[PDB]
Amino acid sequence: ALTQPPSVSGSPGQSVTISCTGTSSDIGSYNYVSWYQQHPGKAPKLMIYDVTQRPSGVSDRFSGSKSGNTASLTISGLQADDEADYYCSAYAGRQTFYIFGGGTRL
Amino acid sequence: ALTQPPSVSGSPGQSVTISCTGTSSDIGSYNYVSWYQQHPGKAPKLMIYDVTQRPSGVSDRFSGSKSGNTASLTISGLQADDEADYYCSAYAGRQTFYIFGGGTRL
Amino acid sequence: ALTQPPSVSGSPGQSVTISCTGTSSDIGSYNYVSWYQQHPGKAPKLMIYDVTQRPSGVSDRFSGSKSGNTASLTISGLQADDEADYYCSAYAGRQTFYIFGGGTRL
Amino acid sequence: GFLGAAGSTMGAASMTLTVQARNLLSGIKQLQARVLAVEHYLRDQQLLGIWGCSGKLICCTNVPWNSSWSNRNLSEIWDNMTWLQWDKEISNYTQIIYGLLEESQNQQEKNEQDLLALD
Amino acid sequence: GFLGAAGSTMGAASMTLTVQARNLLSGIKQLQARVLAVEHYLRDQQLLGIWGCSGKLICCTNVPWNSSWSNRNLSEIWDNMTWLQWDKEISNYTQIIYGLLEESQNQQEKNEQDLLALD
Amino acid sequence: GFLGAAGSTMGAASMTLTVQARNLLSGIKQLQARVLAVEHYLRDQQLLGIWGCSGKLICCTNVPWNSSWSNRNLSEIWDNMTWLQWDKEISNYTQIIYGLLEESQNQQEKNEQDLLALD
Amino acid sequence: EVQLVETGGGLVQPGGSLKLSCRASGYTFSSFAMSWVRQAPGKGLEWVSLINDRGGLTFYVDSVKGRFTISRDNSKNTLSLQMHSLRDGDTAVYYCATGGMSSALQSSKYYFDFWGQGALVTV
Amino acid sequence: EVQLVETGGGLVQPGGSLKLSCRASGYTFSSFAMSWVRQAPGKGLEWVSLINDRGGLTFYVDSVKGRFTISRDNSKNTLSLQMHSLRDGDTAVYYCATGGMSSALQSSKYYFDFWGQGALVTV
Amino acid sequence: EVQLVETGGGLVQPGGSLKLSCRASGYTFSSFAMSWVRQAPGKGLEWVSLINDRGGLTFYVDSVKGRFTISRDNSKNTLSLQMHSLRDGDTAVYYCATGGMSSALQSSKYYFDFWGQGALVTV
Ligand SMILES: *[C@@H]1O[C@H](CO)[C@@H](O)[C@H](O)[C@H]1NC(C)=O
Ligand SMILES: *[C@@H]1O[C@H](CO)[C@@H](O)[C@H](O)[C@H]1NC(C)=O
Ligand SMILES: *[C@@H]1O[C@H](CO)[C@@H](O)[C@H](O)[C@H]1NC(C)=O
Ligand SMILES: *[C@@H]1O[C@H](CO)[C@@H](O)[C@H](O)[C@H]1NC(C)=O
Ligand SMILES: *[C@@H]1O[C@H](CO)[C@@H](O)[C@H](O)[C@H]1NC(C)=O
Ligand SMILES: *[C@@H]1O[C@H](CO)[C@@H](O)[C@H](O)[C@H]1NC(C)=O
């Protein structure tokens, strides 16, 4: 599994950084680390796909990045409606297709 | 190895049940669980081959069955000449060809 | 790794035996156990290649042999200039290309 | 020798496949005969290639035996029967089998392409 | 049917390769036509063999796409384009690709030989 | 270029196999010459197929070198000898080698069939 | 819009069997690969299984290779999962997901595009 | 009837070598696969090795892959086994068995049809 | 004579990267396979990596498969090694070696013919 801090917070209107660190076989070698936003009681929605790309329907306040073996999601302009559990998901090859991290509560 | 009770008994003329439980890769997925009868000081003889089939020369008092991951041998009409150590043998794929259980003394 | 005694010694002019024992997958099945002589502060030099063959430039006082899973180097006519750390190196297949032993100080 | 196994059982005859394979290839009328023989040879090699058997004389596949084609036991086919008798018994089913073999290989090729596409 | 996918997308047409493959092979002037047709067929099979594709209709390779040959997206090529249009667009680059495929297979064969040489 | 490696060492010449392979295939008398050339090409491809080498230019096998055929060192054969000299030296042993290669592949095919038969 | 709706069972004794069936609409079903992703009541999410767009290829997590079978019927627009020997560690919400793979002639996915609401499998 | 008769050694020091030779009659030797099955004096039986009907293919238990070699001579109707580095855990009765495999064109076996009397290998 | 001369870095913080470059002369570079062999200051030597004569094939010790890349430029007579994520267990002298493999048409090596003087990589 990927490791990220269990809790992230900040004042509304400010940016926050959420990040998860994996190994060379999970995040480092493959540029496929997506991010999902899950509201309590709801299914996760896709927020980021690929390292830096966003799906249609998601605002530009959510921006991904990667450095080394650590993937990050920057959420600018924090809203009350963004307080959801965020997960990262990395492609880890043919034997282990996807590895998800633990959640962080925003 | 396959696990069966270490001892089985009963009155002459009554039926007994001998069974061994394996995993999904041993007994469950392959319908090849044979049974052997070994008298002390003698080599084992084939009693049952395949899940339900009997070899020529063996009486019809010995009958095999399988359910889930557990194989059974029913011995009806128990005779004094049947007090022998019984073993099950399951085919377990190409890497592990055969897995034998422990013996049960009848 | 291969195991050889940590220290070998003898009087000048006498022979000594240096040997390392491996497993069936390292020394036994492959007839490729080379020996190297390393002087302190210097890079190792090739002394023996193959089980019994010597490279050009090395004197005939260094002679290799193999029996079972144990490889040996016999050094006859011991000189003061032979006090160096000796290592054996065995080919161990395609997954593990080379296995070196620990050193022995002569 | 060439066709010496024709009267032998299918099992015994399966061990001499290279003798016939070698012997299959070994004015106007003769050129037509030679060109046609080459075209036939190539059609059989192309057909094996379509099935994924381009380099094999004994090629195992993923098409199950229906049992409607023949409900004989393996000992009846391989030990108590010749290839001429077998060919006669299933002469009405070879187009069904060939079609299934082609479809199965097409599915295999697509599956291999998709497996190779996993990073 | 034969060439029925010619107006279909490259993706849809890639599923009917055996129909055309089977149909490709299926006095003096006619013998010349038949011998030439066989020579062409064999040249294409030899060329696939040189690339290591002797038994495949869909053969993946180790040659990267340069993007100078065509900078189109996969959806533009496989979903919004036919094989005739694709063939026309890269008709000036097929000799470069063929040369790279031959060199890549030669390197692969040498690498396989060297890997097999490890005891 | 075609046959440019003929005077080169066997090692150096082994890197140009596709040049000759491509060049091998590239009224009545000419049709006979073309049909015979095709038959020869196909005989060589069939022979490689029998050995399990249908798609390879460099094909490693399971037949050991006897050393009676030639007791030369690898450097003597690959670095100090050409393919014409090598072919001349073993011209009396190629039928023995071909027979062993055919038998070895037949054994390999039976072993592969039996391994695939393990559930 | 695109919707995925799970149908499935509830409480099943340890060691039994349960099958889920997921209906989908709003897109061409046969054009996308499908996955099942599991979330325990107090945990995050983990991938469980992946099936190709055609259904020929299936992939599983090592811990479930001998228990779960994933299949898809492209004429019925239905993705189903069948699990046997339900262990106590398998109780969770099981979500359908669209994405996670593509068949070579399509752009790469390796992510999930659409999610269902989730069936709750308990023991 | 069908008979299998073992010939072999006795007490061999740890780490040595021992070869068994099993003669068979009453059936066509070359038509059946052969196996060796081991039984420790106080235990049940376990499979040790399998050889095909032709002798080309051999299979071993992981614990014996580097110590045991199984071979068969179909002209002499003889099945032999050779073991090296005899460990203390290898002391047992070694039984010849006919069956355990078939060469694709025969009905499935995956069981042993005939048994010998057993050679006792001790250390 | 044959000489191998290492060029490289020195002290690099844990988790960083370092590249070695080894020049060679006195023999045809493209005719021999090359290896890197590592010796910790207080230990003996262990093999780290092997590259073929052409450079197409590379082999590594399992513990370094995800950290070290070996490459060779046969026109520059240069063998280089690049390592990432330098762990504390990787501090050692790294020696260039000529030999360890041959490309099928040459006599077997499986030993090292020539050695350099060694670059010291510390953390
Ligand atoms: C022909 O039949 C006889 C029956 O006794 C058999 O022994 C012989 O092997 C058969 N011939 C061939 C070539 O199989
Ligand atoms: C077997 O053949 C019959 C007759 O063609 C057909 O109806 C049946 O569906 C076939 N079964 C299979 C499994 O192919
Ligand atoms: C021809 O184009 C139409 C466009 O509506 C499409 O529906 C049809 O499938 C195409 N035909 C083929 C054979 O692809
Ligand atoms: C792509 O093609 C151009 C034009 O031929 C060439 O200059 C360039 O080097 C090529 N790039 C690759 C990576 O092959
Ligand atoms: C011919 O021999 C000379 C000897 O000096 C050699 O240098 C040259 O490479 C050879 N030619 C070929 C084509 O190998
Ligand atoms: C080598 O060839 C000689 C002469 O034909 C033959 O007698 C000998 O048995 C052969 N050896 C091998 C191992 O094939």
Tab-separated table of N, CA, C and O and ligand atoms in Angstrom, chain D residues 4 7-9, ligand 1:
chain	number	residue	atom	x	y	z
D	4	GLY	N	4.471	-45.545	-44.847
D	4	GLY	CA	4.555	-46.886	-44.295
D	4	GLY	C	3.678	-47.084	-43.078
D	4	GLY	O	3.329	-48.222	-42.750
D	7	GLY	N	-1.156	-48.036	-42.556
D	7	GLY	CA	-1.959	-49.092	-41.981
D	7	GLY	C	-1.765	-49.263	-40.493
D	7	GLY	O	-2.389	-50.140	-39.889
D	8	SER	N	-0.923	-48.436	-39.881
D	8	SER	CA	-0.608	-48.516	-38.467
D	8	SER	C	-1.623	-47.693	-37.688
D	8	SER	O	-2.433	-46.961	-38.256
D	9	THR	N	-1.562	-47.793	-36.368
D	9	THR	CA	-2.518	-47.068	-35.558
D	9	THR	C	-2.173	-45.584	-35.606
D	9	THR	O	-1.077	-45.198	-36.020
J	1	LIG	C1	-0.622	-55.042	-38.898
J	1	LIG	O1	-1.438	-55.812	-38.004
J	1	LIG	C2	-0.683	-56.727	-37.195
J	1	LIG	C3	-1.685	-57.543	-36.410
J	1	LIG	O2	-1.062	-58.641	-35.758
J	1	LIG	C4	0.270	-55.941	-36.306
J	1	LIG	O3	1.038	-56.848	-35.522
J	1	LIG	C5	1.189	-55.080	-37.160
J	1	LIG	O4	1.993	-54.251	-36.331
J	1	LIG	C6	0.368	-54.198	-38.096
J	1	LIG	N1	1.240	-53.444	-38.985
J	1	LIG	C7	1.543	-52.155	-38.801
J	1	LIG	C8	2.452	-51.543	-39.825
J	1	LIG	O5	1.110	-51.513	-37.850
